[PDB]
């Protein structure tokens, strides 16, 4: 008989310990140790309890990369990326990154260290554009001998969060384009009569969070240039291209919202998005040097590469460049167009089959970018006795989220749900997702009374 | 360009092909091949959206072992234990393992190899029993000169369901003994009034997996022992122990209910549901070799281990054994004696809180076995919106399956819900799961409207 | 110094402890606990001393998969097929299994849901089989006044052992037709001579394990399609297709066995022989619903599909579902084509070898299945002082097992010996064993006197 | 017989006898084609070969060993995105639960179980954050009594963290600098008082100064402060920095009075993924109550009963370092921390007395707090001697160690030094190595019959 069984010694089960018999420490630190077998059972067993990773159908956000690249990032787990003169070579690698996403979006830098910063997501590359537009305005107005302590920038109503972070964290007004069923989004002439000489710059959307679609950054460019031809004002666009970043260049080369745009003098995109890396990676890239401002920035030369020093954050992991520039060279241009393509492919075939049901309607009939929202149908709503609020809990209990939400101004009365399409999710799943939407509108649809959430629509 | 990048070459990103755009075969063998990794995909990504093994409380089988004998199991999956020619060290180790479980149960045969048999799980086990118990009372019927043709068995309603199969698949008629608020368990004076001339055997179950009880198997035996007498008719046991079997030695050790009593000539268990090993596992254990018919049975030596040949199936993975007797040795008594201590310790924690909230109440103050049922206060109930199948929807969409349904005959109108608890189902688990049911309980008394189920009840 | 080193503690070397100077245990679980390190070798050192799984010869399962669903088979080791609520995609993928199974037999139902069952083997498939064929043949007696309480069933002597135990466990008459050289198959006129008032079934075999040949399924067709019409007894076949299940398809498209037959109601196979996956698979499927009996059987709807609920068996591992899916998409018609293709070559090759040898005389010119039989030439059998039994020996000390047998009745005076050529025994293989044989004859020619089995013939 | 494709990628091709083996890594452009995993992992992972290895960096105070369940459990998180709480709100809770414990270990008195506090990447976002709200608790004061709140600035010692001119960059804040001298190495409460004002927005003591490796007395600067605020009226506070002190203080100088338990002390910071002891990508921000979290930056969303306060400059982020936080402080506790910081500190204080042993090194401080510490030259013996410490980094760089050294912050700019930092997995016997390369490198520079660049430099 083992006297210390119970206590975590060399002969101890998991779970026939006192340890498994106590709850995990909501508050303080426990006192003394357990065996690593045990910690790693209490960690882990908490995370079963929620969405599956391949199942959450609200993310944009990477949840599948192949097994080599799984092994070189998680072999870089303990590799620092701001440690750049101790893993030089990784810093050239982020730049060579930067480089190629530059030329994916059309750079006409002639430099080949193009001018661009790593992120860990859009948020930071979002905010490292707005800092940069806010310091370029704030230059110019002072050399003008003009205010430059009100700034602003304008953006759809469709915005994503982080921008509100930005308007919040630096104290920068926000100007919000509704949307509406006429104009689903950025109307060029709208945005523009929102600016005045303080505004920064305007936001055009690759990839709205809320709708799939993207914001015609083309027409805004025409328009802004008759404005600031007008005004004098200047007003640049940085693109938010957070999905559509890794999806336009391959699916739509044509398509002309990059810098071969006279105003677009920086672009931001969410590599962990649809650049296919897991969680941990953004990137922002300027059209040239000279519209990064030297209050934000500086560069160092490591082994012949020119590495722009601008960051929000300092220490983080090195292991999303690894993944970036692993995908860049295993897949290439053809690679990337073959699994967007097949992205793409199936949300168009989800799309084509939701609009066959009874009860929905899609809010686009044009998929650029690999998700879509869908509502019910306005008839089909007033008698029914559930909402997509219902929906989502329906599929819920088959491990999927599918995200119900109202839209962004004056579309707000339109409760809406998306699906997002990301790569690791196929033509059989999306059969199995649509197969339990089939069989959750016929459940809901036998129900006698109206749900909490129809009732409040009432 | 790879021209065969999507039609599968060694280039192919799975979620860049052909293949991952088609639906997975529903009806014909796909005319040609794919790549290993994209068939690996096709079948992993079918099994993602359903209920995770650890959340699965509805089970009473292992879907937890620990890393060695995970290891163990996984390298003997090319072993078919029936090769016991080519395999004599896993015959004999089957034979090692059927001893065990002979003398945890008591059995007093002198032969140093046990009698008993491997079964796939509780289901073969009992039909062996039953097949077993079903010979030996035509024999004696035959000689007596008494018909045979129209044999019985009696068992409680709350009897599995593979005993409704053995009725089936051998055409032999199954008496119920019916649950009752007073009888909770099978009652042996109402158990005899259904014994006759042609009954083979009655079936007390240890784990009743409608309730959580033990039949009361000396109680039973000594009924049973008086009526023989002055009837003749010879009728023994069958102990069903598909959990308690590996129960009641560790925790229980003094109450008799196994071969220590008279009448109690074979006993079966469920290797993989408290036997701790993954699933595929059965034992069923005769008292005597004068048990085991000849007709069923023979036995062959392997390596001086006289190992009896019974069984339903025949080729069949051996890592079962391996597993078990792993857990023989790695626990020992004292180690199951631990672990399912844990597993009843958590089950008796749950018990006691669901008692303390305002719906429930338990139907029995008496946890003998590592799970038990509640139902809903009948003041309570009435007044209420919901029922407890809502509530195992509210859970589901957490990811747990924590099943609700009605009790067997003459409590049929008791909607119940169960929890097992099993060996990696921790405290801090049971805190989730508690959490989640106090937070579906407030949403559900928000509702203004009956749901489905609660009006099916009116 | 550490006090507690051969005890068990955390710095204990396995073969340096007082639990690797004792015994493994042989009647007694051990009181205590021992490290898993400890306990991992304990069970894993005994499997060593036996045949290894690739080189068994004797067995048809499977002993090699590839890596892909090895690891696919390892992470479901803790999925309880039976809990088909809970996995429901699982036990949708069961049912597409069967679907493809039927239609690989031609089956002519149409529905989309075909009519079959999950099994472990061969054993419970047949038994199912049988079991139908029972229960049907009972009904059409009752409703014609005739009696139900004599069955009989036909089938070759060279019966698998499952066909005894199905007898003796429902204790039906098992009747059987003799080989001969003039018949080394099932003889129909033979067979149809054992036909009565009470033959429930006709059992054909595909791929006889005695001899690797056929029962001519078409031929027994033939003749009870005329002795039905003669006698009105409705008596059916069931194909033993426990290996042939998965080469017939594949190999022979044009050859008539299976659901193409009038009068073959159902149909079993081995999953885990040459279905190719690892032990633990068999299947059986009837011609349509209306030869299952609705006492034997119900169905559940899950996701939309219709599965049958009959089995012996009751929770057991889903891991030999994932991979039979996985083998279907995988390699498709072409693939399993090519891998038996290979598996029957190397079987004709090895037959075409021994045939060159003097000692040696093939039992049949033709090989059909992956495996054959061979016996010593009359003459040399008569002068040689050795048999096959000594041959055996000489190849188990390479590590072969290579099993000698005698034929069943009207051909026991031979002594035969089989090699079965699986998935994973490569013509390299071969080489290295037909080595080995010559060699073992090049020593047994050695003898001066006869061995035990030799003076055992005489 | 002949493979056709091999050079060019098929199911035989060796990595090594292709045609991209061949072809140089792109450097500006995406390929046009793809090539086979293995190809792309090897072009990849060859590059990260000819570089320090981790655990032989010793400029880094960023994690660079966990144990192998730490390790297995944050790999299988790979793919788990932390912004997505409602898809993963047991990921959520496990961060309040993290920043609880952070919280009580740094004595808070904040009576809500849901702790103020925010998860980061590291410092860097926590000291914005901290930052921010000060300034922004500051904007608040000065708007409410009708005083400018255009001009803020903030105090700090010259031996700052870059991250502080980050934010005093990119939020245009002017920050005020407070000199290190030998009589002063630490930041001196009285000196930095002189630079506060009526627009100082907080004064940021720092916890294991990177230059210098020492401890900023923040109970003194506290008490300095409160006699000031009450003469002032400006309400100055304290944001301590204490990216490592912040898991050093509370095992090993559990009275040091640095943390919520001093009245200015405001917020805190702190890099999990330095001392916290989990791999890159963690640090943590805590406030001394919600009244000192601006809800002009925050809101707070209940997830499974737990009040998780929303505010960060980073969105969708790696939930693996979460999930290795929580691992840590169960797997090792607070009695589990304390030996693994004990061993780090130790290793660093014989490190820094064998330094001391060596004829040509003197060390910048006797007081050995956080498991680092910085030696210079003996005066005598660098004016004599044809090396510097620079000369010393790169032989030591040739046996893969990195020992980095640099001239320290203002009015000791003149001290050319090298500084050693012990995180979990170097070793006593690791050290030993260390020292005789150390050693052996001194030997070898000692045979110059000519000063090396750097040394002519100083003159
Ligand atoms: C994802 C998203 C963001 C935020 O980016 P993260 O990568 O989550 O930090 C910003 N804008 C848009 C349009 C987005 O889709
Ligand atoms: C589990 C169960 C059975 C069926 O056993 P399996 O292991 O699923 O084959 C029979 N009886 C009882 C009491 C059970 O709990
Ligand atoms: C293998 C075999 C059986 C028994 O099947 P299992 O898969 O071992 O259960 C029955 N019949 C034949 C012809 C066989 O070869
Ligand atoms: C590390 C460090 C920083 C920067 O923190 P990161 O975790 O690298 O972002 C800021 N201040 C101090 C004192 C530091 O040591």
């Known amino acids: 008989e083992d006297l210390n069984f119970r206590k975590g010694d060399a002969k101890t089960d998991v779970f026939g310990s006192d340890r498994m018999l106590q709850p995990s420490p909501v508050e303080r630190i426990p006192d003394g140790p357990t065996t690593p077998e045990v910690a790693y059972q209490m960690v882990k067993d908490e995370t079963?309890?929620?969405?599956?990773?391949?199942l959450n159908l609200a993310t944009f956000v990477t949840t599948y990369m192949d097994d080599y690249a799984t092994k070189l990032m998680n072999e870089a787990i303990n590799i620092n990326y701001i440690d750049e003169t101790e893993y030089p070579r990784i810093a050239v690698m982020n730049g060579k990154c930067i480089n190629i996403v530059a030329n994916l979006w059309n750079s006409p830098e002639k430099d080949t260290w193009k001018t661009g910063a790593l992120a860990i997501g859009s948020s930071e590359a979002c905010m490292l554009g707005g800092v940069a537009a806010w310091l370029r305005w704030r230059k110019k107005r002072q050399a003008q001998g003009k205010p430059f302590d009100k700034p602003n920038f304008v953006i759809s109503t469709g915005f994503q969060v982080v921008w509100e972070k930005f308007a919040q964290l630096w104290q920068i007004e926000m100007r919000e384009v509704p949307l509406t069923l006429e104009k689903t989004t950025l109307d060029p002439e709208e945005a523009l009569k929102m600016c005045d000489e303080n505004t920064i710059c305007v936001v055009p959307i690759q990839g709205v969070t809320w709708t799939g679609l993207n914001d015609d950054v083309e027409a805004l460019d025409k328009a802004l240039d008759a404005y600031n031809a007008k005004t004098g004002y200047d007003i640049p666009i940085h693109v938010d291209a957070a999905s559509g970043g890794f999806i336009?260049?391959?699916?739509?080369?044509?398509?002309?919202?990059?810098?071969?745009?006279?105003?677009?003098?920086?672009?931001?995109?969410?590599?962990?998005?649809?650049?296919?890396?897991?969680?941990?990676?953004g990137w922002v890239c300027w059209k040239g040097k000279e519209y990064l401002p030297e209050e934000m920035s500086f560069s160092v030369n490591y082994?012949?590469?020119?590495?722009?020093?601008?960051?929000?954050?300092?220490?983080?992991?090195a292991a999303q460049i690894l993944g970036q520039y692993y995908q860049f060279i295993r897949l290439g241009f053809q690679g990337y167009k073959?699994?967007?393509?097949?992205?793409?492919?199936?949300?168009?075939?989800?799309?084509?089959?939701?609009?066959?049901?009874?009860?929905?309607?899609?809010?686009?009939?044009?998929?650029?970018?690999?998700?879509?929202?869908?509502?019910?149908?306005?008839e089909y709503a007033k008698s029914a006795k559930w909402t997509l609020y219902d929906l989502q809990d329906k599929l819920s209990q088959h491990g999927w989220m599918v995200p119900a939400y109202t839209l962004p101004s004056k579309l707000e009365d339109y409760v809406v749900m998306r699906v997002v399409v990301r790569q690791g999710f196929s033509r059989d799943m999306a059969d199995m997702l649509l197969g339990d939407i089939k069989n959750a509108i016929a459940e809901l649809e036998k129900l006698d009374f109206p749900t909490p959430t129809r009732m409040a629509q009432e």
Do not use: C
């Open 48 to 54: 079963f309890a929620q969405t599956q990773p391949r």
């Open 338 to 378: 073959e699994v967007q393509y097949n992205s793409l492919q199936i949300a168009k075939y989800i799309h084509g089959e939701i609009a066959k049901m009874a009860p929905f309607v899609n809010y686009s009939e044009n998929v650029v970018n690999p998700l879509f929202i869908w509502y019910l149908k306005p």
């Open 248 to 281: 336009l260049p391959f699916l739509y080369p044509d398509t002309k919202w990059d810098f071969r745009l006279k105003w677009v003098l920086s672009i931001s995109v969410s590599g962990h998005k649809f650049g296919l890396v897991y969680p941990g990676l």
């Open 303 to 317: 082994l012949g590469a020119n590495i722009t020093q601008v960051g929000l954050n300092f220490s983080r992991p």
